[PDB]
């Protein structure tokens, strides 16, 4: 179930992948890396099998 | 050859002369009478229609409804002196409320 009537798409992305995105945005806003894909992948693998 | 362009007016002059000749107002008329009448009718028609156009552009409507003519004739004072006992079909009346009949409170 994704984005039919219950969870709006903006609300869906605001409530489904938060624990990775806040760190990613924080590191691209402070550590300012031209290539932040490694950080996002590392934080995705931390909860790769933990995704409900 | 035409005759209206001799004076530069717009209202017909031959028509006025024929209609006044067959109107039995008298038996014999001069030459300046038809042109003079055409001229005065021209002036009065222009006087009315300029205000008609002003009222037309007041409400931003291209077509001139008779309400505009009623307002233009009534609001002027010389017209109201000259058009004293005359009404207009579909004309309506200009807005007016008596002064002492105006309620107010704090």
């Amino acid at each position: 179930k994704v984005d039919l009537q219950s969870l709006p798409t903006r609300a869906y992305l605001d409530q489904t992948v938060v624990p990775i995105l806040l760190q990613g945005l924080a590191v691209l806003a402070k550590e300012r890396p031209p290539n932040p894909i490694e950080f996002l992948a590392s934080y995705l693998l931390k909860n790769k099998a933990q995704f409900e | 050859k035409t005759r209206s362009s001799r004076a530069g007016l717009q209202f017909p002059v031959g028509r006025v002369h024929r209609l006044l000749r067959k109107g039995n107002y008298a038996e014999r008329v001069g030459a300046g009478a038809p042109v003079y009448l055409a001229a005065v009718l021209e002036y009065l028609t222009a006087e009315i229609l300029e205000l008609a156009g002003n009222a037309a552009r007041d409400n931003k409507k291209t077509r001139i409804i008779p309400r505009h003519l009623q307002l233009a004739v009534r609001n002027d004072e010389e017209l109201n002196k000259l058009l004293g006992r005359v009404t207009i079909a579909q004309g309506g009346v200009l807005p007016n409320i008596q002064s002492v009949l105006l309620p107010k409170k704090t």
């Binding site: 984005d3 903006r10 609300a11 869906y12 605001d14 806040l22 | -």
Partner: protein, 328 residues
């Protein structure tokens, strides 16, 4: 229970009032008349008001009906009023008297003085771009050149150290209301080249706000606006110098010499200054002459899922800080 709407309409007590004033001829923006990516350049120089990158808010103001923005805000997938790849000037830090095309190529000014700024900074790399002056009627100043966001968007180009200019008429260099007969004039059909010479990496100072209450978020009548505002008297006193501090006003390669030096240290926006009604075309980017080197200035106007995902990305981009901030 119906006084909340009147408070939201009069202006309330949340800093700036909720009654906008942008009385010059403001166009090219504010397309969707609802709660969507919007923008309001304000009369007051330094007021940037935007709605893209949306955010939720706390419901139940005065025990009325439950607002839809309690925990699950309504989505949005439609036109977004900005640009990503290479902003052709800008759509946020502008004056509400500039006429731009829908594709954002031509710039038409007001009856009085006007300018447009940009939203992209330059630190290293080649930015040899051009401003093709389509036409320049008499009594229409066409001074062009880089400037700073701190610059007053209605002040003459060069009036402050934030802004740098080269006069289109008689080539007389002007800055801080000081004029020296320096070069020859330009105008009709005269393409003004512009390549800010900092191919090497530099360092500058970006942000130092002095006010907070004017930076608030509240519903205007049916939509939110982000009061991201600059100040002046504090910003001018943080003025510093930086590397490659020279705003050169070229002539498409040929240069008469940089008119004024020691430019303000900060993010650079190429400001185009007009003085009366006049149009002008633009081409900016990390290229030399041809606009299509990167993505050719995408407008993000499509109905597919790409617009949906980009809008949700922007929503999250502002949602992170609207969650970690803590609303008063």
């Amino acid at each position: 229970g119906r006084g909340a709407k009147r408070k939201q309409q009069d202006g309330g007590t949340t800093g700036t009032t909720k009654k906008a004033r942008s009385d010059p001829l403001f166009s090219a923006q504010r397309l969707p008349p609802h709660g969507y990516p919007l923008e309001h350049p304000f009369n007051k120089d330094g007021y940037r008001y935007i709605l893209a990158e949306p955010d939720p808010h706390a419901p139940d103001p005065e025990k009325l009906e439950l607002d839809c923005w309690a925990g699950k805000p309504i989505p949005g997938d439609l036109y977004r009023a900005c640009l990503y790849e290479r902003v052709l000037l800008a759509l946020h830090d502008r004056a509400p008297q500039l006429k731009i095309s829908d594709d954002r190529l031509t710039v038409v000014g007001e009856k009085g003085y006007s300018m447009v700024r940009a939203s992209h900074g330059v630190r290293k790399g080649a930015w040899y771009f051009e401003i093709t002056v389509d036409e320049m009627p008499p009594d229409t100043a066409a001074r062009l050149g880089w400037s700073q966001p701190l610059g007053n968007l209605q002040a003459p180009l060069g009036y402050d150290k934030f802004s740098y200019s080269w006069r289109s008429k008689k080539g007389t260099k002007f800055h801080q209301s000081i004029g020296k007969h320096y070069s020859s004039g330009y105008g009709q059909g005269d393409v003004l080249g512009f390549y800010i010479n900092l191919p090497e990496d530099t360092e500058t100072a970006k942000s130092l706000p002095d006010t907070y209450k004017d930076k608030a978020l509240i519903k205007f009548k049916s939509y939110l606006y982000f009061e991201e505002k600059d100040f002046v008297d504090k910003a001018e006193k943080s003025l510093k110098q930086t590397p490659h501090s020279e705003i050169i006003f070229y002539k498409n390669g040929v240069n008469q010499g940089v008119a004024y030096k020691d430019i303000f240290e900060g993010v650079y926006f190429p400001a185009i200054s007009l003085y009366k009604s006049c149009t002008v075309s633009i081409n900016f980017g990390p290229c030399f002459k041809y606009p299509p080197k990167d993505l050719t200035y995408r407008p993000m106007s499509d109905m597919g899922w790409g617009a949906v995902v980009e809008h949700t990305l922007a929503d999250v981009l502002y949602h992170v800080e609207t969650e970690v901030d803590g609303r008063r």
